[PDB]
Amino acid sequence: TLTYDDIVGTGLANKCPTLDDTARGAYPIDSSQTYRIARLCLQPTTFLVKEEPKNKRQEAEFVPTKLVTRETTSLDQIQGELKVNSDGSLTFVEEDGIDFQPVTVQMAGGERIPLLFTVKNLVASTQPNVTSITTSTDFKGEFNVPSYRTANFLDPKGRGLASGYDSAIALPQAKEEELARANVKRFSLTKGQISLNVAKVDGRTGEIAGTFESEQLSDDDMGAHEPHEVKIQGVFYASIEPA
Amino acid sequence: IFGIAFSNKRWLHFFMLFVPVTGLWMSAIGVVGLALNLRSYDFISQEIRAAEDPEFETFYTKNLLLNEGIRAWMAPQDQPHENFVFPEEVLPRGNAL
Amino acid sequence: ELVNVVDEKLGTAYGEKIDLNNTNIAAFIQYRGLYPTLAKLIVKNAPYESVEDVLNIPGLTERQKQILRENLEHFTVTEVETALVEGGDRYNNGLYK
Amino acid sequence: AELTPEVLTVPLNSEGKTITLTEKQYLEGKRLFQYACASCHVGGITKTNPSLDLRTETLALATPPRDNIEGLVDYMKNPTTYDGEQEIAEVHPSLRSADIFPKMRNLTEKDLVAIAGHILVEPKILGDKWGGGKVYY
Amino acid sequence: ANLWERFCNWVTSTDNRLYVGWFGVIMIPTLLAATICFVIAFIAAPPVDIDGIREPVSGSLLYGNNIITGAVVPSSNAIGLHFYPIWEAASLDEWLYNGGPYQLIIFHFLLGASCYMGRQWELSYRLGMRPWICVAYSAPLASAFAVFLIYPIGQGSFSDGMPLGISGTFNFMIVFQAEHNILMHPFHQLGVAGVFGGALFCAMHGSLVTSSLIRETTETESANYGYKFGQEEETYNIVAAHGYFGRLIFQYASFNNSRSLHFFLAAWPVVGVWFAALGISTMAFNLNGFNFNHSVIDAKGNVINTWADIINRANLGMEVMHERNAHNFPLDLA
Amino acid sequence: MEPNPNRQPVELNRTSLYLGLLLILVLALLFSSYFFN
Amino acid sequence: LIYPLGQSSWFFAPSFGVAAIFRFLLFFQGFHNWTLNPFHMMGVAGVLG
Amino acid sequence: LSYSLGALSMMGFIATCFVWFNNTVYPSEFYGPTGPEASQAQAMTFLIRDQKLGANVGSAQGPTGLGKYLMRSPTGEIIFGGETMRFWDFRGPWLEPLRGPNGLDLNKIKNDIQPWQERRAAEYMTHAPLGSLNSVGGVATEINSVNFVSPRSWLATSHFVLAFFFLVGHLWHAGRARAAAAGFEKGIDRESEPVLSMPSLD
Amino acid sequence: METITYVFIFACIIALFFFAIFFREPPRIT
Amino acid sequence: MEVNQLGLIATALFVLVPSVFLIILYVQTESQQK
Amino acid sequence: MEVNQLGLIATALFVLVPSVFLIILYVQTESQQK
Amino acid sequence: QAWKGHAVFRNKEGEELFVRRMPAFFESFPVILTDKNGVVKADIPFRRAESKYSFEQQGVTVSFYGGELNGQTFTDPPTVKSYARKAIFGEIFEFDTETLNSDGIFRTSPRG
Ligand code: CLA
Ligand code: CLA
Ligand code: CLA
Ligand code: CLA
Ligand code: CLA
Ligand SMILES: CC(C)=CCC/C(C)=C/CC/C(C)=C/CC/C(C)=C/CC/C(C)=C/CC/C(C)=C/CC/C(C)=C/CC/C(C)=C/CC/C(C)=C/CC1=CC(=O)C(C)=C(C)C1=O
Ligand SMILES: CC(C)=CCC/C(C)=C/CC/C(C)=C/CC/C(C)=C/CC/C(C)=C/CC/C(C)=C/CC/C(C)=C/CC/C(C)=C/CC/C(C)=C/CC1=CC(=O)C(C)=C(C)C1=O
Ligand SMILES: CCCCCCCCCCCCCCCC(=O)OC[C@H](CO[C@@H]1O[C@H](CS(=O)(=O)O)[C@@H](O)[C@H](O)[C@H]1O)OC(=O)CCCCCCCCCCCCCCC
Ligand SMILES: CCCCCCCCCCCCCCCC(=O)OC[C@H](COP(=O)(O)OC[C@@H](O)CO)OC(=O)CCCCCCCCCCCCCCC
Ligand code: OEX
Ligand SMILES: [Ca+2]
Ligand SMILES: [Ca+2]
Ligand SMILES: [Cl-]
Ligand SMILES: [Cl-]
Ligand SMILES: [Cl-]
The missing domain is CATH 3.30.2050.10 (photosynthetic oxygen evolving center domain)
Known part of the structure; x- marks a missing residue:
């Protein structure tokens, strides 16, 4: 069991917990029981920015970028209600946590793109009739993106x-x-979208891990310029609990 | 050590007169300009850029913010004949401080 | 046509009273009995469609309800302004003395 | 201008009674306020919570009222939040918490009265400077 | 001689146009690295997040600066006193964003300038000179250490080191005044006496030696030709110089001993500047200038302002405005 | 150092200065309109 | 002499005092941005030089 | 003597840093909080205050986009925000109970802060090692009232001054010892001036 | 154009250092 | 009139550089021993 | 950046005019009889 | 080009307010309006959270007498603020800034 002194300065503090390859089980949902996510962690591994269309007005692509703000990017210690809906779908209602990080990434040629990487006020839902959380469960939902400053x-x-x-x-x-x-x-407030793809489930502990992809706008400098479209990809971890 | 050296003692000692004397004379000329508020206060190109571009920042723009604080915070007590009353709400301040 | 939303809000009741939907929590120190206990409950349970809705916060004591009633004349409600409530600014708006 | 008996005359209670402090009580009050309180309350503000100051108008609107000797002396024994709702001796210097705030151990009832009198007299001298913070320096 | 012996003989050679020496073996590469990085950064570096608040400050010429506004900007407050070499960054783009050039430059510079000081001792030894020129150079050197290393250490960040730039220097000075009231600190006052006095005595000595040059030339030529490099005889009349200056003030306030005079010329600015350096190096640990704010009070208790209180108002303006987005809490504690 | 024997003095007489200045000034007078465009 | 003569009055000349002179320095910074002035910069180089 | 002056100079600078940063062999109970300590204690104080008022301190975004109370270090550890980001390497008995594997723990912050921690953070915040030469406690613009300069400041400044002058003494005496040993500490022999027997540089 | 000017003047000064050091008039004892 | 904003320095340097070259050469010819 | 359009010629002549004066004087000194 | 006319500022109660003029020393100067006795009645705040004198709160208006704007009254806070900013300079004028690409920054006269 690792302590702060084991972790400090290694980079591990910016990583989400992982589950080993044997974690391919199923976590039963009792629709009479109330649930919470006690810890949601999101570790971005790639930031992509949509190039501004030259004027051809074809499909502008999302291109790779270089992170310049170091290992300061992950969202963690996030918690919230996990509702069981009448159609058997699950809805996560984000309540609190370290649910944002300012991030600056740099385009080829030097353009710096600051963004508030976030899941603030996330409301994410699964498909109907999820009697167990399995490696086939996905969560999809939206969140708020307030002004970066x-x-x-x-x-x-x-x-x-x-x-x-x-x-x-x-x-x-x-x-x-x-x-x-x-x-x-001017103070911006827009919507973002996120998909959580479960790849691993520990049926016994209530722990799940997988990959995510989120889409949101970058910083608009309090209305001075147009924001960019950003796509964030990475891994996630969540601990589900009866509560 | 340095690449060059004095070789002429008369030159050395004249230079010792020249340098601080010339410096003081130069500072005096600047102060004559300041008598008229004829300052080197700004770089116009800097201001035009910064006015249009809220992401453009230099140590030059930073020092002007300091100057604006100095002026607003010191003027009422430093210039009592002006009878300045600056309500709390108009005083320039950054976050928290 | 671009508007500073905080300046604009100052021309509403927000500029005249404690706005239960927007005003920073230290404003409740202005009146007897509101801070910190009721202030915390009010901010936590905002927004309110009307001032009287503040009386409907769960768990209140009869004493607390009466203090609230005596202070409704000092309260208002206006639309939630994102710029005033983001950043946890209702709890700490970067202003000290 | 002088530190007159009138300047030194402050409310004893909420019922209209005053007390006239002596010059020596005023000096003792300054000294003791510096000794026990000024680390957080220099100049009438509060460093660990600037929202609450020691201005007389502020003390008057506190619950119970703190704009008089009795209110302040009671505060120093059993401090409360501004609405009177919680007792904060565990985090604020008081006689009740002299065990954890050892500077309160040697404060006598007479000392508390002197500190109380300082808090009430100082704004009568300093006006807006008292509880004003750096703006009024 | 073997190769090592030959190499040592060349390194320590008194015949090299510029002396190398063992200090020079460290000085040359470190000063070259610092110089090259500085030049490239000053021209071409992108904006740097000095205060760790994702608010990059442009220092370079190509990014909208002139010679006066330009700087190599200090490393990020997020880094603090952490060592941030190129290899600790994930990329050069990250390194640049976080102000990596500043650390590379100031560390190579401080090492190189320390070796410059050692090298001054070293050559003096090879030439059979007395050894203390290097002690005079310890004054500006100590001053550079104060603003680039000791102040950052005390405050906990290289983001508070003096920027490498003209306007950045002024920024450092103004913020230093706000936070330490340096003007009211006796070590800075000794520093001022050191440099004003240094300039005074420089002009004085210059003027007195020049005034008593022995006639060796005609009016159609520079009097400088009256002195020949390496001549044995002194080129001015010190007795006439002392005769003049002793009457200007009074006899015993003037030096008749050139060794004593020249020692005074060395000592006055060097000691003053040592105190200047120590002012910065001790205000680094927040022992600050004299504070007479509200020191004068009338019979009632009204504050009677002095010039100290007017200084205070200016300082407040600096304080409240500096790094306008960096403070979240009411006190600026470092 | 032992001196270089290949060194020669250089000259420009007054007439050549006047001819040269004339060339340069007249060329400037001619080309300036095209420089300003 | 010249500085206050160009200004409104002698009030804005330096007062003869240690702290007063310091006030004069900080006034010149806040009002004149005097550090930015190349004539002051040449003064600094001559004094430090 | 010169070797010892060099050594004592080195030791002086080390002692300066020891008393400035170390709170183990220089307990803050006796010496006051370190500079890093008091700055962290300020962030702790206002986190506690605003959280009591209902702020969610994990999700509170400051004016710059960084967390107002809490943010990440460059390696990801959760640390206090604002200027004290520089001081995230600080460690102290009053703060450590809030530390988890990943740095400051939000659940511990929300639920486990004890009154003794609030008191200590408030005490340290208001006894930061800042003060004037005449011992007026606080920032340089603070009014007269509190007679305080931290022992940490007295001990760091004195020992920097002493260490510095001892480096000077080292150079003075090392350079003199060399010259005296070689026989030219009193000046150049007029009839045997070394440079006169050396070839010209050019 | 400004940047070119600043860098040009700087480059001239550096060249000047080179000549002032390596191509100085040598000091001669008479 | 919308002229090329480099025309002024182009013309100035065009005149001054070669004129100065010639003046240098002329004056140092005059100063040579007769 | 919106700089003063005369800054370039001002700077160039500020350097060239006195520099050229000095070079003229230097070279004609060198060419005098040894 | 032309005088805009004399700007008269009034609050919601109809009291005349006077903009504090910029002294020559100041490159920038706040916008503060007082009544005839020098009491502060309105300003343009920096920090808004505790503002009490904003033009929005005080219902500040401006009416022009003489010049191009003679007979006109403006009540919208952006416009009233704009004219208050110019009133610190004294009388208000219309300028052609296009012809010379004027940059908006004061220069001295031949007297200076
Ligand atoms: C690197 C730091 C630095 C340095 C080296 C300087 C250097 C200088 N400064 Mg600048 N200054 C700085 C930073 C610096 N400054 C900063 C950051 C600011 C903020 C903007 C200023 C603001 C500033 C102002 C406002 C002024 C200067 C001035 C000067 C010049 C003063 C010359 C002098 O000796 O006057 C000293 C006075 C004299 C030489 C007058 C004669 C004195 C007589 C002979 C005295 C006789 C005394 C007598 C014997 C009796 C003594 C009695 C005893 C009891 C006292 C000099 C060029 C001054 C200047 O430019 O003047 C033209 C000036 O007015 N500075
Ligand atoms: C004289 C040569 C010299 C020296 C002393 C330095 C020194 C430095 N370089 Mg530089 N560098 C040089 C030449 C030099 N450089 C050259 C030629 C290049 C071009 C290739 C560079 C390119 C370069 C880059 C790109 C960077 C540096 C960086 C650094 C720093 C960290 C170095 C390190 O981690 O080593 C570790 C080595 C040791 C600890 C040596 C231990 C082994 C010995 C035998 C033990 C004894 C040493 C002990 C500490 C005591 C000293 C002895 C003393 C008592 C006499 C330091 C300021 C980094 C930087 O500036 O960070 C901000 C950085 O990013 N250098
Ligand atoms: C500013 C630093 C400095 C300088 C310029 C000098 C200069 C001098 N020293 Mg001293 N020395 C110092 C600090 C310094 N010293 C300190 C702190 C100590 C205590 C450990 C000593 C202990 C010492 C001894 C025992 C001796 C000297 C001696 C001497 C003299 C002869 C040359 C020599 O042997 O150098 C030796 C140089 C050093 C011991 C340190 C030099 C430090 C500078 C900064 C160079 C660092 C180079 C390093 C390799 C770079 C590290 C890179 C890193 C990234 C790995 C010369 C005057 C000799 C002498 O003749 O005395 C009578 C001698 O025997 N010194
Ligand atoms: C390591 C040395 C050291 C340190 C850190 C302290 C620290 C402290 N002392 Mg102690 N003390 C010391 C040595 C020291 N002292 C010495 C040598 C004596 C005998 C005189 C005393 C006797 C003493 C008394 C009687 C008192 C203190 C008190 C105090 C406190 C307040 C100090 C003050 O107000 O300074 C004021 C600042 C100064 C006087 C300025 C000093 C500046 C010097 C002159 C500069 C030195 C420069 C350098 C060394 C000279 C080199 C010159 C160069 C050309 C070579 C403080 C905790 C007071 C206290 O609070 O006690 C409870 C108190 O009443 N001290
Ligand atoms: C004015 C002159 C002056 C004064 C008053 C001081 C004063 C002080 N210094 Mg400074 N110092 C000075 C000049 C001065 N110094 C100079 C010129 C240098 C070289 C630059 C230093 C270098 C220096 C260092 C490196 C340090 C100090 C430290 C200290 C403090 C503790 C001293 C100590 O305990 O020594 C130690 C005592 C001895 C060496 C004597 C023997 C002590 C024995 C071994 C103790 C045994 C105790 C043990 C428990 C016995 C129990 C018995 C058991 C069986 C029951 C003290 C405030 C310390 C400090 O607090 O810094 C912040 C420290 O680390 N000094
Ligand atoms: C990439 C880019 C563009 C980088 C550049 C960025 C950048 C910031 C550049 C800096 C720009 C810059 C230079 C700014 C400063 C501009 C400025 C303020 C200039 C001042 C100009 C000026 C005319 C001022 C007027 C006052 C004046 C005359 C000052 C002169 C100061 C001066 C040169 C003093 C001498 C300094 C000096 C090092 C002298 C050494 C003398 C010497 C060899 C002594 C040794 C010696 C001593 C003896 O005793 C004996 C016996 C002998 C024998 C002997 O040898
Ligand atoms: C209308 C009426 C009543 C008229 C009456 C007039 C009348 C006849 C009066 C006579 C009566 C009378 C005398 C009255 C006196 C009245 C009075 C006391 C007036 C006060 C005047 C006044 C303010 C005096 C201040 C004193 C003063 C000038 C102090 C400054 C001098 C001072 C401190 C000097 C020391 C500084 C110092 C260490 C200098 C050495 C450094 C230096 C210059 C090195 C350079 C150098 C020095 C050399 O040494 C030589 C060699 C060479 C080479 C060289 O480089
Ligand atoms: C009431 C307080 C209680 C007392 C406490 C004591 C405090 C300690 C006092 C410090 C003692 C100082 C000793 C000085 C000795 C000395 O220097 O001798 C060296 C020579 C010897 O004098 C020369 O002396 C020679 C003879 S001999 O060398 O002495 O044998 C002679 O030939 C020559 O003409 C003569 O000029 O002194 C001089 O060259 C002239 C004096 C120069 C002043 C030296 C001080 C250094 C500069 C001041 C520091 C700057 C401070 C301001 C900041 C800008
Ligand atoms: C470790 C190696 C370090 C090498 C670093 C390079 C150092 C460069 C030294 C300056 C060379 C240029 C000298 C030209 C001038 C030159 O050749 O001087 C040579 C001259 C020689 O003096 P003499 O006594 O021999 O000459 C007298 C007779 O000729 C009378 O006419 O030296 C001086 O005059 C000393 C005072 C001037 C000192 C000037 C120092 C200026 C420092 C540089 C500041 C500019 C910074 C700009 C930055 C962008
Ligand atoms: O970084 Mn640069 O300046 Ca030293 O104080 Mn705190 O931090 Mn920031 O404020 Mn003030
Ligand atoms: Ca899946
Ligand atoms: Ca235009
Ligand atoms: Cl208030
Ligand atoms: Cl700043
Ligand atoms: Cl902060």
């Missing part, structure tokens, strides 16, 4: 939404109109 954030010229100057004070007599988009900060 919150309302106090001040730009390099001191301008902000809930604080800061409301004008370009270094250009006292410039015409305001051309600068409105930079001067007037």
